[PDB]
Amino acid sequence: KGKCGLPEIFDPPEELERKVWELARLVWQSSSVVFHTGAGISTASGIPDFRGPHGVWTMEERGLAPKFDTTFESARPTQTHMALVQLERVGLLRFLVSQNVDGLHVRSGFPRDKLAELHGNMFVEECAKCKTQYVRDTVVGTMGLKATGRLCTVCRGELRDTILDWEDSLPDRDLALADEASRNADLSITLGTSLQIRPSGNLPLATKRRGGRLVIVNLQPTKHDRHADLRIHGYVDEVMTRLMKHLGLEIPAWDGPRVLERALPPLPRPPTPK
Ligand SMILES: Nc1ncnc2c1ncn2[C@@H]1O[C@H](COP(=O)(O)OP(=O)(O)OC[C@H]2O[C@@H](O)[C@H](O)[C@@H]2O)[C@@H](O)[C@H]1O
Ligand SMILES: [Zn+2]
Numbered sequence: 001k002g003k004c005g006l007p008e009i010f011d012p013p014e015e016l017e018r019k020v021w022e023l024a025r026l027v028w029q030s031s032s033v034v035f036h037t038g039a040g041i042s043t044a045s046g047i048p049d050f051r052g053p054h055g056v057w058t059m060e061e062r063g064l065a066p067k068f069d070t071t072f073e074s075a076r077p078t079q080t081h082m083a084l085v086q087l088e089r090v091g092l093l094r095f096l097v098s099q100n101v102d103g104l105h106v107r108s109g110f111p112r113d114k115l116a117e118l119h120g121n122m123f124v125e126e127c128a129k130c131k132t133q134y135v136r137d138t139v140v141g142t143m144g145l146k147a148t149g150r151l152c153t154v155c156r157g158e159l160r161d162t163i164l165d166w167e168d169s170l171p172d173r174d175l176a177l178a179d180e181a182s183r184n185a186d187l188s189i190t191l192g193t194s195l196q197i198r199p200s201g202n203l204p205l206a207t208k209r210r211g212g213r214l215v216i217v218n219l220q221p222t223k224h225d226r227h228a229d230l231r232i233h234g235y236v237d238e239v240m241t242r243l244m245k246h247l248g249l250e251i252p253a254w255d256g257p258r259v260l261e262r263a264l265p266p267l268p269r270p271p272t273p274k
Helices: 013-029 056-060 079-089 172-183 200-209 236-247
Strands: 033-037 095-098 115-117 124-127 133-135 147-151 158-161 187-191 213-217 230-232
Touching: 013 187, 013 213, 013 230, 013 236, 033 079, 033 172, 033 200, 079 236, 095 172, 115 172, 172 200, 187 200, 187 236, 200 213
Parallel strands: 033 095, 033 187, 095 115, 187 213, 213 230
Antiparallel strands: 124 133, 124 158, 147 158
16 A cells, blocks of 8 residues: 655765754744654564565565564564653653554553554454453454454453554544644654555644644655655654754663553753753
């Protein structure tokens, strides 16, 4: 599905630094910062993307299977995952919209009330009856919104996976929160997504339409490149490491899988430059 296997682009060191300083500036000056993440933020942990050079669909085109260097369970959040945890803690991230099913945002300790997982989460099952969600320690075992073989404990209703199939519509609440955050954002930053899937890929444009700024961080071209105020071509982990340095923020260490349901008030953060 969509455009697969396009050549990657790398801003050279001085181009990159200048662009990351510009991004820092946009973050400092924007009250509402919304991040939009795709499969590219998980490749540095061993999970292949879909449309990159060895992406799932690109490889399918060659009659090759995708290569994982991890199970979903033994996957570690990347520096990028952890940077987003910290940005949220200090109040420099309003909301996070993800297209990833890998479960890494949740397991990194990102508060679920500021997270929309538009395409589902491998570790989450949902009661058909009450709609209460269960975050599990291991992948649920089914995809396509199917019965997992477990009953709810809030009820005895049927538990199903939340992995959307091709024809399946997006979770009502997640999309509602994603829309609200994107329309009301001063700044949308996309990370490691080619922005080819609607409505997910068009959400960062709602920010642009409403007068806000748009930053696209990606190794390949994306569908909405022409609409961005800043395009940054580099490994996300590098882009984020440099950004956090400029912002004067530590990237916290991951202590293993942890679920946080609700965000706290912002922690102290350094003062803004002149
Ligand atoms: N370390 C990295 N740093 C920066 N960019 C990266 C990195 N690794 C990969 N990328 C880029 O990330 C992008 C990932 O885009 P896709 O593979 O299309 O993944 P995504 O946009 O998340 O896909 C959207 C949706 O498509 C469906 O197949 C599936 O439902 C998925 O959630 C690619 O353009 C690739 O160049
Ligand atoms: Zn129930």
